[PDB]
Design a protein around this ligand. Structure first.
Ligand code: KAE
Ligand code: KAE
Lengths: 300, 300
């Protein structure tokens, strides 16, 4: 029993982290086979920050302008190119530690593990969710750009996030590994800010089921509600609408606990309207929305 | 910015996990050089759980009774012995993936990373604290015994915990890697239960400093208190007493934020007496006590 924010073991990703230096700027790269992937703003000067033309900046570079270091070994770059907002540096040596991998883009409301790295050296691992507004509430300091987010299925690493920037509210924005930003953010200096966010309803419900599996039951009730009536309450509390497909996804959890989905929805409605009255659920005094149904089933 | 419960990268430990089978029981072991460490209750049968005499059960075993599997590769056991509540199985092959390591015992109130494992295969990593009652609030299922807890300093893994059992309240108990239990727990069938617990005061204060470093300031005040006046409030709320050494440990955080320790203590007294009135701190609606001052400095 117990329930923790649990990340995937990070070893397969640790073996892929390298350091990329261009000019006086250093950040992290992801070395898979003979390609190193990193954020293209590594080629930016302080000067060309308001409106950098990355095509211009890149044509003015040669392979020798990029220093890639895999631990103590220097990797010679033999090709360079841009794909959207990521740089691809072809190196003369295939990474012998390359796991099976895929580049997958995730949906708002899905979770992933983040390997925070500095100077090509992993420093910590934690679990994140993609917010509905396409930010992530990460933990990142100077030098963390190029850190990646991922999930592991069997032996296969699905890379889904590369870290690019921190927004004024202290949340984080980045791209998939094709270089395509999550959300309406760009790799240049603007007043860009996170948009309004909302609470991931299907995840809160998944986490209430986790609580029931772990013996917290004080919030349960005999009452039930309809899908339409629940969604009216969700909208009033800035919660995402619940779909029948969400209800379906919650089926296994509902069956394991014998608590109908709409029954758990009635409990969530009361929690939103009444608060906790000084109690906790799985060691939290608020409703947690960064565990998916899959996360709950995996850990519970 | 941001603040997450952050574990150490687990790769150095993933390379040490193996599967140990004795009879019909299988659990996890830790393979360092040519030794595999695992919980000795792997040699128990359902028959004698009440008062197992491990010296008797072990003398009745031979090397052939222990099956060790490192991934797809079987390891021949060439020796066996018991050290307190851990089994040491000498194998004919030194683990080529052995990191630099040390066996250290931690203090109540210290944190560590846990690599949850099943059948020798890592499944997830999360951060834990040793409770003042010497339990840990882990996340562990059937087959998780033998999972280890650790910290990493520079390149060196300090193993501090091996998982042995789950208590009736759903918390967890285990030993250091010398086989010595944390707390008054034994590897046999009793009605043993976690003793009364208390809140780790120095950690709560560290977490408030993390919040100030991260821009949460609503809880600060112009008031101050004495060390002795604070401790009287701490005792009322089942918080541990604060020492001058705790004040000294909090010095660097005090200096970075310009908030005297005893000033922050005054804020904590008010938070205890008044609650939070619907506000959050670092995304929590309760006072978090599983971040040490070191964890805060490392991440902030
Ligand atoms: O390494 C970090 C960094 C990442 C992070 O997640 N959090 C941090 C916290 C504290 C200091 C630095 C960081 N940085 C350097 C590169 N950078 C950048 C450079 C060019 C382009 Cl074009 C773009 Cl998009 C982004 C982002 C960031 C600097 N920003 C400035 C605004 O205030 C937040 C920090
Ligand atoms: O693999 C687990 C296991 C660990 C855990 O952390 N949580 C679990 C949750 C659910 C089911 C199993 C576990 N088990 C098998 C070995 N065992 C044991 C065997 C002999 C001795 Cl002598 C000792 Cl001390 C301990 C502990 C545990 C079984 N217990 C029974 C009581 O209820 C809690 C689980």
């Amino acid at each position: 029993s117990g329930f923790r924010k649990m990340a995937f073991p990070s070893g397969k990703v640790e073996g892929c982290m390298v350091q990329v230096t261009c000019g006086t700027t250093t950040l992290n790269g992801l070395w898979l086979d003979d390609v190193v992937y990193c954020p293209r703003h590594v080629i930016c000067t302080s000067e060309d920050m308001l409106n950098p033309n990355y095509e211009d900046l890149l044509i003015r570079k040669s392979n020798h302008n990029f220093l890639v270091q895999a631990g103590n070994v220097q990797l010679r770059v033999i090709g360079h190119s841009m794909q959207n907002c990521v740089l691809k540096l072809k190196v003369d040596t295939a990474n012998p530690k390359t796991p099976k991998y895929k580049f997958v883009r995730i949906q708002p409301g899905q979770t992933f593990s983040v390997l925070a790295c500095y100077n090509g050296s992993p420093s910590g691992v934690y679990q994140c969710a993609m917010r509905p507004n396409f930010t992530i509430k990460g933990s990142f300091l100077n030098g963390s750009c190029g850190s990646v987010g991922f999930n592991i299925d069997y032996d296969c690493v699905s890379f889904c996030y590369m870290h690019h920037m921190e927004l004024p509210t202290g949340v984080h924005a980045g791209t998939d590994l094709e270089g395509n930003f999550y959300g309406p953010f760009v790799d240049r200096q603007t007043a860009q800010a996170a948009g309004t966010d909302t609470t991931i309803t299907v995840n809160v419900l998944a986490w209430l089921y986790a609580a029931v599996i772990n013996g917290d039951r004080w919030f349960l009730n005999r009452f039930t509600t309809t899908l339409n009536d629940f969604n009216l309450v969700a909208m009033k509390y800035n919660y995402e609408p619940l779909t029948q497909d969400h209800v379906d996804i919650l089926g296994p959890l509902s069956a394991q606990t014998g608590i109908a989905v709409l029954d758990m929805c009635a409990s969530l409605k009361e929690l939103l309207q009444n608060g906790m009255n000084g109690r906790t659920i799985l060691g939290s005094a608020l409703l947690e929305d960064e565990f998916t149904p899959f996360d709950v089933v995996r850990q519970c």
